[PDB]
């Protein structure tokens, strides 16, 4: 699983 | 911006 | 399973 | 702004 | 899943 | 999971 | 700002 | 795990 | 920006 | 600033 | 897993 | 920037 932002 | 998966 | 917005 | 949830 | 952005 | 961006 | 979890 | 950045 | 994987 | 913890 | 931000 | 492993 993942998560990111920019 | 921003993901998320699973 | 993915979600993500910009 | 964003707020999500799986 | 659920999502929010404003 | 969760986010919160602000 | 954010805040995240898993 | 978690994470908070501000 | 910010990253989590697991 | 940051803070984090698995 | 991992963290990381910038 | 910051990066946590495990």
Same mark, same amino acid.
Request: hydrophobic content about 35%.
């Given at each position: @699983?993942?998560?990111? @932002?920019?």
């Amino acid at each position: @699983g993942y998560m990111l @932002g920019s």
